[PDB]
């Protein structure tokens, strides 16, 4: 699962079988690291209008 | 069922009778009107291609 984002620590407690996290719009906003079983929030990079 | 428009109220019309109010009700009614929407902006390049 690939993408671009800022990976921060997450307070979401995943169930052991779940790996990725989706919002209402089915976009990956939470993920589980495969090497170490920890949950990371994926915040989109701060794109904006100039 | 077949819908009923309103209860029939046959007004007692005659050529020499009038109805005059003896009292009044101060009635406050609500009217809700939308004014604005959420201002949304879309980056076309990011949306189509990331
Ligand atoms: C004014 O007078 C008319 C006629 O007497 C009244 O009209 C009648 O009112 C009764 C009472 O409910 C009804 O049963 C009749 O069917 C009505 N007649 C008609 C032709 O509609 C009227 O109600 C009187 N107005 C007031 C404010 O008392
Ligand atoms: C006109 O209507 C008002 C109410 O809409 C009447 O005021 C009421 O009077 C009675 C008896 O005096 C009280 O018990 C009620 O509490 C009053 N209501 C309010 C809202 O104050 C008034 O008396 C009516 N006038 C006539 C001439 O019929
Ligand atoms: C992966 O291996 C590292 C050491 O190489 C270890 O610390 C970690 O606990 C391991 N994770 C899993 C899920 O086995």
UniProtKB/Swiss-Prot annotation, chain A:
<protein>
    <recommendedName>
        <fullName>Spike protein S1</fullName>
    </recommendedName>
</protein>
<comment type="subunit">
    <text>Binds to host ACE2. RBD also interacts with the N-linked glycan on 'Asn-90' of ACE2. Cleavage of S generates a polybasic C-terminal sequence on S1 that binds to host Neuropilin-1 (NRP1) and Neuropilin-2 (NRP2) receptors. Interacts with host integrin alpha-5/beta-1 (ITGA5:ITGB1) and with ACE2 in complex with integrin alpha-5/beta-1 (ITGA5:ITGB1). May interact via cytoplasmic c-terminus with M protein. May interact (via N-terminus) with host bilirubin and biliverdin, thereby preventing antibody binding to the SARS-CoV-2 spike NTD via an allosteric mechanism.</text>
</comment>
<comment type="function">
    <text>Attaches the virion to the cell membrane by interacting with host receptor, initiating the infection. The major receptor is host ACE2. When S2/S2' has been cleaved, binding to the receptor triggers direct fusion at the cell membrane. When S2/S2' has not been cleaved, binding to the receptor results in internalization of the virus by endocytosis using host TFRC and GRM2 and leading to fusion of the virion membrane with the host endosomal membrane. Alternatively, may use NRP1/NRP2 and integrin as entry receptors.</text>
</comment>
